[PDB]
Amino acid sequence: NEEVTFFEKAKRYIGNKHLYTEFLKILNLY
Amino acid sequence: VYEATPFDPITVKPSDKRRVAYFYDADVGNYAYGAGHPMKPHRIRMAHSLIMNYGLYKKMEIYRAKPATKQEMCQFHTDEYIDFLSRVTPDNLEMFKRESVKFNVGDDCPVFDGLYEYCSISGGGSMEGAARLNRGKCDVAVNYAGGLHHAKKSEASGFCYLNDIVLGIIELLRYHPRVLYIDIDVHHGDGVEEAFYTTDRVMTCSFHKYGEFFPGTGELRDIGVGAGKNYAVNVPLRDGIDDATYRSVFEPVIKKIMEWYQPSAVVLQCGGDSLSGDRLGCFNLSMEGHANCVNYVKSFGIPMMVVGGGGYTMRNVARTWCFETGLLNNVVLDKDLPYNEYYEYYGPDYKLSVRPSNMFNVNTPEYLDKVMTNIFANLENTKYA
Amino acid sequence: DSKVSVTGLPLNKGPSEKIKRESLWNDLKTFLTENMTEESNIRSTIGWNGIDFENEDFCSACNQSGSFLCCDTCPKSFHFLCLDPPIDPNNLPKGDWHCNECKFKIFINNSMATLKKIESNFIKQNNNVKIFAKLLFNIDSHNPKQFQLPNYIKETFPAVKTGSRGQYSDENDKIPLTDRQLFNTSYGQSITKLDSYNPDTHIDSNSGKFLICYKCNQTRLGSWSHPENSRLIMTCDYCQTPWHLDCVPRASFKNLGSKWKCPLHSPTKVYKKIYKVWKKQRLINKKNQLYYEPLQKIGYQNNGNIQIIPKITQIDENSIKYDFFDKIYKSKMVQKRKLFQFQESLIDKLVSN
Amino acid sequence: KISLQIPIKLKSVLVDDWEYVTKDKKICRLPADVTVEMVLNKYEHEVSQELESPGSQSQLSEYCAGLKLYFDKCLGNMLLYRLERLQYDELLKKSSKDQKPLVPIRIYGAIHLLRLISVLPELISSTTMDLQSCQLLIKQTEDFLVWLLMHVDEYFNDKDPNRSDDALYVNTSSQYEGVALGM
Ligand SMILES: [K+]
Ligand SMILES: [Zn+2]
Ligand SMILES: [Zn+2]
Ligand SMILES: [Zn+2]
Ligand SMILES: [Zn+2]
Ligand SMILES: [Zn+2]
């Protein structure tokens, strides 16, 4: 719910695709 | 945390009186690094010259320190290094093509003459100064010949061979618990910071230039290991800083340290290559913007040593050290130069002032706020003495 | 005495007319000192008493320069350490020094019949090593050299290329500025550090628009009638998001050693500190690499070498979404359970009282 | 033209070393814990425990002893990078001062053995050996590689010398740098 909103806000704010890939890589490493 | 505050002139503190000691050997001016070298022992003479024509000999006592011997010098370096220094001469250099590459003494800091003698004089001065302080006849010791802070334990890097500041700090540590070493030469004093990196009884605080510049060390994150975590304060500045910004950075950091470290003896390395117009340095400081810091350190009233340092243009550095000594003796010196033997260098105005250039200042205030914030946040843990 | 000094002429000589033309327009008180200095020896430690073949200029073993011994019988020369055993320069070989190969030739007397004879001899003695025999015979006949990886293994990775002197260089090194030193002595003061000139560094070249700062979102360009509000935008080399030298607090232009990397590249090492090691492979580039799609997308863990898609194990965004939710909720559950066991032990020790 | 197909992970380990003794300026800590002799004795012992044919184990022990002696005689000549040669010389000095003639096999680690193997194709193809003999050598060293890759994380683990201890590598002082590289 609001966490889907979290990840959509991230996808929009971080903006570029590559940087969102990097965010997800960090998240997966954790 | 940094906040722009203008340049208030330097003035003598009325009450702080102290019985000082001036170390000078009449011979060190003869040495001379061969040909074209940025640091040379002529500027050790010019300084003294002015102090003897302004007549400060009535205001303080001048000695000559009996030189250091090999055993006394080897409190820091290895036997082999000290010995190779004491042996080498430009005639039999070829005999030493293994050591002269191991020890780095053939390339940037050549071997010229009187090498061992020059280094011994500087070392003996530094040690006897710490000792007279230690024993306590005086309350200050100026030694404008010493101050070779790049000389590491087993290699002479950066035109300096014997690292007498370390010997002085050790002889200081023989009696005083905690000693604070304040370095304001433009380069980073890696010799001392290294040789007290794993201890908590000596706290080194260096304001230097970072970037692709000698010796490439001194980041903000080098903050001491072992028991000496958070006991080293490197401040990397940027180019073109002026006197106002330098004072506005200096004052709070030193006040905070002396609030929390509480040293019993200060060692201030009063180098002159942070001045406007040097062959090596890139700052844009004046004479007042450089005497202000020593005035500030003196204000607190701790047994201290003032040591010499760099110096690449003998005119600026000579006049700067004459002014610094005058300031230390609670006397504001008259801005007109008397007649001395080396009256010819100080043209064209023949005055005691140093003039800044219009180089562009780069130290943005937000940068300074972030740096001083990090440093205060680290130092939050030195509260226990 | 007639020998010229730094000044251009003998020391006992005034200036020439050319210099004085092109350089022109048309008691003291330190007499003292030997009266005031009195020695100080107050220190604590005063108890301490205190055929003419021309040789090479290269180490043909390492093809770099140095102080080297030359050969009396072949033109090949080595540094003093590049021998087996390596020779001390203090005790040089008394007389002519002969390399391994020429010493070999004069040992064999230029007669291959003795070569084959002693080869048969050697393989006769150590039948224990009958296989390696040829090499065991030949090892003493080849001149030393440093160890270069065989190229068939340098090719397995594309991002591994040798430097100038045969050194590892994994493309994280910027470049050989070389001619930039001539550039460093710029006729017009516009040196590498880019001081007092940032008009067109704040503006993209090809596109033409402004380089924004990811952390404060302003290309602060100031005004070159009022330059004290520039802020030195610099752009990364990998991702190219332009940053301010005041957001990533570093204050220098990384221009000589490596390429600068933003704080937006994830790890390349771990140091678990509780202290385990790497989580990333190298670039096992080319055709040889095998990409593997999982059949299960919720609890497959497998590595940290993931590759994201709409042995490197591909995965989808929603999958990692689920996996991070799993981490978060299992972590909150175990934290709640730790608080629960804490409070329940507290209640047990209270009711015991 | 013979070709030796090393597993990829050992190629990565070799390149990792090739950086470590290049622009990070580390060297191999000696005497390491697992020398060459312990490696090969363990290999041969484990493989003779499973093998039943006599000639198989004969060729096994022959390969072991031969690789041993050839490593022993070649290490000084062509397995050392430029930066390491000084440590080599110092080891010779220490051995000759202690009157124990030097054996490479009882000091040097396995990474040099991987260096040897990686060389091996050129070593063989520079010779006039038999096709069947060189072929059996390739098959043999390949089986050795397999057994080594089964245990690759017993020897080639990473430990970051600058923080805890006993990592496979150590750092050099500036004097050692100066002498070894810039003699
Ligand atoms: K310390
Ligand atoms: Zn300096
Ligand atoms: Zn060489
Ligand atoms: Zn020869
Ligand atoms: Zn910014
Ligand atoms: Zn980046």
Tab-separated table of C-alpha atoms in Angstrom, chain B residues 23-24 48-49 51-53 57 61-72 75 97-98 124 127-128 131-132 135 137 171 174 210-212 238 339-341 360 362 364-367 370, chain C residues 28-30 32-33 36-46 48-50 67 80 88-90 193 195-196 215 220 227-228 230-232 245-247 249-257:
chain	number	residue	atom	x	y	z
B	23	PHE	CA	68.125	30.611	19.998
B	24	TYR	CA	70.512	31.656	17.236
B	48	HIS	CA	68.312	37.827	13.071
B	49	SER	CA	69.764	40.891	11.367
B	51	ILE	CA	66.091	41.712	15.426
B	52	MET	CA	69.554	43.118	16.060
B	53	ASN	CA	68.838	46.414	14.308
B	57	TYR	CA	68.375	42.207	22.400
B	61	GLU	CA	67.945	36.595	26.170
B	62	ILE	CA	69.629	34.989	23.158
B	63	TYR	CA	71.604	31.750	23.477
B	64	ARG	CA	73.307	29.261	21.194
B	65	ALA	CA	72.327	25.661	21.792
B	66	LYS	CA	75.161	23.143	22.113
B	67	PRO	CA	74.519	20.754	18.848
B	68	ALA	CA	72.969	17.303	19.007
B	69	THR	CA	75.166	14.212	18.991
B	70	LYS	CA	74.402	10.966	17.190
B	71	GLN	CA	72.942	9.196	20.227
B	72	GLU	CA	70.670	12.144	20.980
B	75	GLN	CA	65.963	8.971	19.673
B	97	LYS	CA	74.268	4.156	-4.797
B	98	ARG	CA	72.234	1.660	-2.770
B	124	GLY	CA	70.171	20.714	19.309
B	127	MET	CA	65.906	19.986	22.163
B	128	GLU	CA	67.614	22.556	24.385
B	131	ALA	CA	64.541	21.385	27.963
B	132	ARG	CA	64.834	24.954	29.230
B	135	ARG	CA	63.208	22.787	33.515
B	137	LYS	CA	63.942	28.935	33.317
B	171	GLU	CA	61.870	16.065	25.437
B	174	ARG	CA	59.447	13.830	29.507
B	210	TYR	CA	44.529	19.468	-0.256
B	211	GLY	CA	44.447	18.532	-3.902
B	212	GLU	CA	47.174	17.431	-6.236
B	238	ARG	CA	41.362	25.169	-0.893
B	339	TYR	CA	69.524	50.448	8.089
B	340	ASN	CA	70.939	46.909	8.064
B	341	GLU	CA	73.511	45.011	6.028
B	360	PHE	CA	40.634	34.708	-6.601
B	362	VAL	CA	37.816	29.764	-3.683
B	364	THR	CA	33.146	28.754	-0.239
B	365	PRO	CA	31.554	29.219	3.201
B	366	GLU	CA	29.356	26.113	2.915
B	367	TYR	CA	32.492	24.028	2.436
B	370	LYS	CA	30.765	21.164	6.527
C	28	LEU	CA	74.903	48.418	12.523
C	29	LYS	CA	73.747	46.503	15.641
C	30	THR	CA	74.445	42.815	14.939
C	32	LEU	CA	77.294	42.032	19.036
C	33	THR	CA	76.152	38.337	19.322
C	36	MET	CA	75.402	38.001	24.252
C	37	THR	CA	75.078	34.329	23.205
C	38	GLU	CA	76.038	32.076	26.170
C	39	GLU	CA	75.812	28.327	25.492
C	40	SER	CA	72.872	26.226	26.644
C	41	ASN	CA	73.594	22.628	27.705
C	42	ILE	CA	70.671	22.334	30.108
C	43	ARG	CA	69.315	19.319	28.172
C	44	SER	CA	68.628	16.021	30.033
C	45	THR	CA	70.599	13.763	27.760
C	46	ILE	CA	73.991	15.533	28.113
C	48	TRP	CA	75.015	10.597	26.392
C	49	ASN	CA	78.549	10.691	24.777
C	50	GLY	CA	76.898	10.191	21.279
C	67	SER	CA	71.822	0.878	-12.924
C	80	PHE	CA	71.797	-6.235	-10.355
C	88	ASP	CA	75.288	-7.636	-4.840
C	89	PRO	CA	76.815	-4.503	-6.438
C	90	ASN	CA	79.239	-4.140	-3.513
C	193	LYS	CA	42.378	23.586	-11.862
C	195	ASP	CA	40.292	28.978	-11.436
C	196	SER	CA	38.374	32.185	-12.261
C	215	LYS	CA	21.876	17.479	-4.370
C	220	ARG	CA	25.079	28.214	-9.726
C	227	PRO	CA	31.954	35.972	-9.809
C	228	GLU	CA	31.683	35.247	-6.075
C	230	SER	CA	30.006	30.223	-8.682
C	231	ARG	CA	30.153	26.777	-7.141
C	232	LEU	CA	32.389	24.576	-9.339
C	245	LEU	CA	32.234	20.300	-4.902
C	246	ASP	CA	30.325	21.351	-1.788
C	247	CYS	CA	27.766	18.510	-1.721
C	249	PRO	CA	32.473	17.624	0.483
C	250	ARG	CA	35.767	16.909	-1.283
C	251	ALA	CA	37.694	20.004	-2.383
C	252	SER	CA	39.945	19.246	-5.363
C	253	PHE	CA	39.609	18.325	-9.020
C	254	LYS	CA	40.358	14.629	-9.355
C	255	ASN	CA	42.392	14.970	-12.518
C	256	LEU	CA	45.589	12.891	-12.270
C	257	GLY	CA	45.259	9.513	-10.553
